[PDB]
Symmetry: D2
Subunit: 480 residues, 4 copies
């Protein structure tokens, strides 16, 4: 599997504490932690020299080689996970997207085949419920029981394509609750967005600004509140993907304070920048920002999202990395509704949070670990195998430099995209060394990776972190 490796003089930073210790690794696992380790001679030894050592990042939202209209996103499972590793991320969770009226299981097999053959790092899979009926219900059950899936996503947007009704939502959340799965949502109101898009085009607003104006944050907030409400009535845990706005995040905060089982996933884009760039005079640049929900035009938004990720009102971060070329984006040059949706973010996720939340004093290093790996591992039932530096855990570690300062650019990023939405931003905090599966995959700015080295990691239902309260609530007429 993996050679012996010793990291010396490192400061271990887990979500619960930080402490000085050496780390000995072999065959994909952490074997010893402490001082003066009884270790074989001739072991490859890295001198951490007081630098931080954290669990590798888990990016819970990717779209590598995602199909769209006979094309594919430009970062595939190989190049996309190269990008992840370059940024300190050692596990990704991608979305399987079956065509409406097609098999979920057959889609899952396709995605397993693509990723097993190309991923540089360990991965898992969410399965999107793009339509609903009795056979789909059966497949969901089968996928949870037999295929290592515990997370499924529904769409409240994309009217006449993926969108599900309130009756379907109730049916689906009841089912996912009974089976021990996470119920994920893409939460915007598709019915109202459909009208507003028509309204924008009739006003002659065909550029990317038409995208953000046709999807104001009130339509994200409505759909979030409604999802929270249906999930509560069906005793189902809810996970809100791609939290983009202050109002969505406040609804999640509100629901969690009442005791509702609700999680929020901000992304690199909503943590790092705003939507002013939709009004760029450079069409291509503006189209690079087109994603759904969009980036809020309100410039106070990213500081707020970071604040709520710091306080635990939001719990984990993803990227929704979903890159298209300038030529693909330009398909929608005359009509924003035809711009393929998605931006970059996998490489920049951990640096963006360090820069915006840790160097700003909003969160400490332990909460940084929580919001980049450990909470994700707990929610998806991967803890302590992932998201922790502990004996018996997987050898996925990063030597992090808090003092590193790097300018982001399309020129030096691993993505095949020509644009980078964070172009020109100077970020504090970066990885020096990345170890994945016990092997050194980044050092001295050099990537050392193998196509297909990454393993599918099965995720079991009924995560304790998610379901203990649900179960306790389940456990709890007037005779006339």
């Amino acid at each position: 599997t993996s050679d012996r490796l010793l990291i010396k003089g490192g400061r271990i930073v887990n979500d619960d504490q930080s402490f000085y210790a050496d780390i000995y690794m072999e065959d994909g696992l952490i074997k010893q932690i402490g001082d003066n380790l009884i270790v074989p001679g001739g072991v490859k030894t890295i001198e951490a020299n007081g630098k931080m050592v954290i669990p590798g990042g888990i990016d819970v939202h990717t779209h590598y080689q995602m199909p769209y209209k006979g094309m594919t996103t430009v970062d595939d499972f190989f190049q996309g996970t190269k990008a992840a590793l370059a940024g300190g991320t050692t596990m990704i969770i991608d979305h399987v997207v079956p065509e409406p009226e097609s098999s979920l299981t057959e889609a899952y097999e396709k995605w397993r085949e693509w990723a097993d053959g190309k991923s540089c790092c360990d991965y898992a899979l969410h399965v999107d419920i793009t339509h609903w009926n009795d056979s789909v219900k059966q497949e969901v059950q089968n996928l949870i029981k037999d295929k290592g899936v515990n997370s499924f996503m529904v769409y409240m947007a994309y009217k006449d394509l993926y969108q599900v009704s309130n009756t379907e939502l109730y049916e689906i959340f009841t089912c996912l609750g009974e089976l021990g799965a996470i119920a994920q949502v893409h939460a915007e109101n598709g019915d109202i967005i459909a009208q507003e898009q028509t309204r924008m085009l009739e006003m002659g607003i065909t550029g990317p600004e038409g995208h953000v104006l046709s999807r104001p944050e009130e339509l994200e907030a409505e759909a979030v509140f409604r999802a929270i409400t249906i999930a509560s009535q069906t005793n189902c845990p809810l996970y809100v993907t791609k939290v983009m706005s202050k109002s969505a995040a406040d609804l999640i905060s509100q629901a969690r304070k009442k005791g509702n089982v609700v999680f929020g996933e901000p992304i690199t884009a909503s943590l790092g920048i705003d939507g002013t760039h939709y009004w760029s005079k450079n069409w291509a640049k503006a189209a690079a920002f087109v994603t759904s929900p969009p980036l809020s035009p309100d410039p106070t938004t990213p500081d707020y999202i970071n604040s709520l990720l710091a306080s635990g009102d939001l719990q984990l971060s993803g990227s929704a990395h979903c890159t298209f070329s300038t030529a693909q984006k330009a398909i929608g040059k005359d009509n924003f509704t035809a711009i393929p949706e998605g931006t970059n973010g996998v490489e920049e996720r951990m640096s963006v949070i360090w820069d915006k939340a840790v160097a700003t004093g909003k969160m400490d290093e332990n909460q940084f670990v929580a919001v980049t790996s450990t909470n994700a591992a707990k929610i998806f039932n991967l803890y302590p195998r992932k998201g922790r530096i502990s004996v018996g855990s997987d050898s996925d570690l990063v030597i992090w430099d808090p003092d590193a300062v790097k300018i982001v650019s399309a020129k030096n990023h691993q993505s095949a995209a020509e644009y980078n939405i964070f172009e020109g931003m100077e970020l504090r905090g970066a990885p020096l060394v990345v170890i994945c599966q016990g092997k050194i995959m980044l050092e001295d700015g050099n990537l050392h990776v193998t196509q297909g080295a990454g393993r599918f990691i099965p995720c079991s239902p009924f995560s304790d972190y998610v379901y203990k309260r649900i179960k306790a609530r389940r456990k709890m007429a007037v005779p006339r």
Copy 2:
């Protein structure tokens, strides 16, 4: 029309101020206000003797002789307005309910005929949009232009009967906004209520408690938030009927603080009592409380609703007076979904608010006037004809006694109902004398009324109180 009448030594209480003055009336109108009025000899003179004189109450939500399954509510336009006058209310606004797929205009004519022939007092009419299509759109326009209607209601509940989709809501609010009408809603989520009713019956909960448990306040709050959101996107003023819960009222408060044009209508029931009585061992008593949305089981609710009516987060009061006999209620004795919905409240509305909000120190007498007549007159475009004691205004006045104390009972109420949901409650504050159309219709506990004396009062669109901001907001691409 109406004989000369002089009220002397009264303390006039309008929404804006209180002051001592005599009031001279003739032919339906207030002619002079002041001291030492130049008045003809031989005028009928009432000695107010320091007592308050307020504008007659406007009850903006009634259902007199409302049809249901070949029956009718037991209080008709005559007996129902007798009840209103006994309680200090001198104008009512009733709901016209066309069958799905039938003409709105034909329904309006029926209701005009019933009320013109029986009402004791002036009235107006809201028209319920029970279904939606091109011909209904046309009728709405015609009714606003030609028939004195400015208020229309849509249902978010009653799946497969009255319920409208989000696309229909957007269409309808856009239309009502363009035409200068108030958009009213019955705001509960019918899709989810349908599931919960099935769930209650499968648990064997067939009594009235199944009604309140199948319609928890979260389902009122969801639908209110969604209506607020669609109304905001379409620049349409929203009016929430039958505010029953703390969470609904808080959403209205929130929206108004942002600047959204939203009004809330608590009712006598939600101001005066809670939903604990759904669990009464007396089936009949419990069924007397069945209304939609239901009374909150949370006993802190009525004090809170009064508080938000006091602070102006809620603006006006109705009753939704909709009475059925015990025999009619008993149709649903084996299945709560078959209990006809509706309770009493028209007679008790003004006394309930005085007792719960004024004698408690939450609101003063001027705000009492506002929330019982003047705000309703402003919203429905009836001010200063109604809701004000002013020269040239209609002679609809009440001599109110703050020190009166009365126990409510089915035995002494004007309603034909056998039950009164406020049975046994002692209320501070009551009318001594009611003058309507310049005629004394209550004195010494005696009603003096004529069937059909009441006039239809046309209500024009584009009320200033409602539409000035809407118009100003209406009045307010990147070239590449």
Copy 3:
């Protein structure tokens, strides 16, 4: 008193409704409202020609010729009320400020003498409680009973000068509540501000930016919350002067929703602009913004204050007009704690609100009247004499042009100040004609005024709008018999 005057073809805008009618005025009073008025021939007639006619503005917060260290503010009761009238304001309420350990009543007489002799328009007076003891308590009673005062202000700031303790606040609010007066506060925490000033000076931050950084909005919010709490415990109505920050305005909103009797007074400065200009490289410009509480550095502040004035969470507007010359400001050139505090705002108040809340669609014309006159008249017990176009009310009216557009500048303002904190701002909405005491005092951009023409207007205690709930709450304490 005042000649016959007829305004024809006007659209009257009161707080409750708007309607078309002619207005006939004589001897300081509105005599008739309606169509085809029975009127004597030869009456001076103004053609409003569809333009709005509103009640004159009431500015509830001014500091004309306010003394400070042997000097005075540069706009006195004459020039300051010229400024008021030029902007559509026909009544002002100024603050009487007695020196600590001196008589409130003697201070009141000095102020009455200054204003009676110079004011162009009607006025009233608040009295500031700058210190507290038995004789001050007696004077407050006497002033309410005999001198037409119903509003008194206390300071939670200015440690070792004006500041009162929590015991004194309790005593004072109990007393003012018993006597039917409005309890006004200057609400910032003076103990903590003292420390932060020292911290700014030790960091070498001596310019105007040190002023806003030594008084962060948290210190306004703390004092507001504490004043609300003491006022609630003593059944006393509370009025928060100079609402500057979002957080202060949210606490007032929160308290009103619970039923507490609390009023908030934003000022022209907090409605119109933010505090970014404390960091101007021009010292003199930055010092022109120095006022307390300061303008929020958060640029989302003025939009928010306008939003809460629109929704009624805040009820009335003032200016706290308190102007000093550049030479006077420069006394603090080496130390921001020595910059005399105060900015302009009286002339600009009504246009600022129209431009920022009405032309933006946040409030309608009727709420504009409410927040520029009618709510002030109700709170200070001047309604319907002021703040309303009604038969028997005072002839204080403005013909307002919603379509007028004017750039503000020190060059054309009535103030003697060299700086204007709204310099260069283009504002929508302005007065065309101002009538005061039935007399045309502004027309064609010309002022027609007389020194000393203004009358003191006595203000009685126990305003209904303020006290009916307080009284009902007092009317409603049982031991457990054991």
Copy 4:
């Protein structure tokens, strides 16, 4: 030190995860965790049989043998820690209270002597800053550096006894922040409470109900908001003791969301019951509830406090166990201000939280551990030595029965008090076995304890959980060059 011990078949429940494993212990420490442990023959073996095994509770607020007017509370460090252990608590943190104008360090030595000689379990000490001056400042430094103290409490109540001013609060929080200590507060407004007490007595309300009516929750909320504000301005972490009311808990929630470093400590009383019993016709019963801040008369309070402990808006639980006899309480029979303040709670703390938050579905077993030990260990810098079942941690463990159901009564409690404020309450969840310092101190309902067995545990300043953000904020003040 301590004999070999093996617990088999147990379900370990830490704050982060639960898992099945055997636990081997020797000489005060957990030595091995796992399956098939290499263990010496003849080891005392307990069969957990699938039952939960959790870290022993840490009660961060006790007042054992606290002096008051020449008397003492009736539960001393021995009997009081017997009560603790009976309820699943294996460590207590008590408050050292020096007389005003006396030495903090001398008080600390007295308390160390009392506890070292009587405590059954490990303990630590907070030191209360009952007055403030230069020598007290020096002692605080000395206690942190040399005596294992990292937590100090100030009083915002008790006017003319312990109360500190806003200047003193600023000075004290600045000092505690610089030294790496937790700043604890007793947060009620003492100035206003003094007035309201006098008001209650003048109304003839002398019974216990006068206590809760003279201290309405608004006066707790005001003091909380002010403490948050001063702590924020001085970059000092704040810990709110005895969170009793919904409004206090909402202010802590609000401040934490903004990023302020603020902790809240609900107590057994506020988690388990309300204040309706102040109106009991039995004087003695009512007086048994007298504590400060008092129990809220609002019966929705305890459900809400449990909800905010569940969501993490409040982080840790104490008891403020402070018991007086009926005869001692009765000293205030004619005047509630003379009733000695304090109730029971140490024994009942963990069962109350299980019954009211876990069996109700508000929180899971892992958050239960967090709020009964682990968050306290992190805040006071005792993690992972305490609050965790981990190799190298202290052998303080409890075998917990989720299915146990017990009625609370004065008849069977360990306290010397005649009254129990939870009398008659049936609580779900109880300890079966308690191990402390590796020794079985509760089994089969029998206590096995030794007077003086407990050790003082030094607590170091600059806890990472508390100070990493504070430090980062300090690391991040430019003048405008003109």
